[PDB]
DNA sequence: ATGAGACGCTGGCGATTAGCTAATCGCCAGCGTCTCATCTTTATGCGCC
C-alpha cells in the first residue's frame, strides 16, 4: 500500500527481488535523503529513551557519589 | 426615292439576424526549515592639534 512496506521488506529479507522495485526504493531514498545536520552515524542502539536514560543515571551515579 | 426618337414602390415599418464591451465587486495571491561560514554597522564606555 505504501513504499515503506517494500522498504522494510527489502531491508529485512535477503531474497532476490525485481530490479525495478529495488530501483524504486533506492531512487525514492535518494529523492528524499534527509538532513545532514548530525555528523557521524547513529547505529540503532536501544532506540528507547528509558534504557539509555537508565544508562545515563548509571553513569551519573558512578561518576558522582 | 424612310422609318428612330419618349424605359419600375420605396420608405417605413417589423422582424429578423448578428454581435459586443463595460461597470462592480470579490478573491486572492508558494512557503517551510536548518546548517555553515562571511563581513559590516549600531547603543554605551577613552584621547587636543
From Swiss-Prot:
Phenotype upon gene inactivation: Loss of correct processing of pre-crRNA and tracrRNA. Loss of immunity against a plasmid with homology to CRISPR spacer sequences.
Biotechnology: Coexpression of Cas9 with an artificial single guide RNA (sgRNA) which fuses the crRNA with the tracrRNA in human cells has shown it is possible to target and modify DNA sequences of interest. Cas9 plus the 2 sgRNAs have also been expressed individually in human and mouse cells to achieve DNA targeting; cleavage efficiencies of the artificial sgRNA were lower that those for systems with the 2 sgRNAs expressed separately. Microinjection of Cas9-encoding mRNA and a synthetic sgRNA into zebrafish embryos induces targeted mutations.
Subunit-level organization: Monomer. Binds crRNA and tracrRNA.
Domain free text: Has 2 endonuclease domains. The discontinuous RuvC-like domain (approximately residues 1-62, 718-765 and 925-1102) recognizes and cleaves the target DNA noncomplementary to crRNA while the HNH nuclease domain (residues 810-872) cleaves the target DNA complementary to crRNA.
Biological role stated in the UniProt entry: CRISPR (clustered regularly interspaced short palindromic repeat) is an adaptive immune system that provides protection against mobile genetic elements (viruses, transposable elements and conjugative plasmids). CRISPR clusters contain spacers, sequences complementary to antecedent mobile elements, and target invading nucleic acids. CRISPR clusters are transcribed and processed into CRISPR RNA (crRNA). In type II CRISPR systems correct processing of pre-crRNA requires a trans-encoded small RNA (tracrRNA), endogenous ribonuclease 3 (rnc) and this protein.
UniProt family annotation: Belongs to the CRISPR-associated protein Cas9 family. Subtype II-A subfamily.
Name listed for the protein in its UniProt record: CRISPR-associated endonuclease Cas9/Csn1
Gene responsible for this protein: cas9
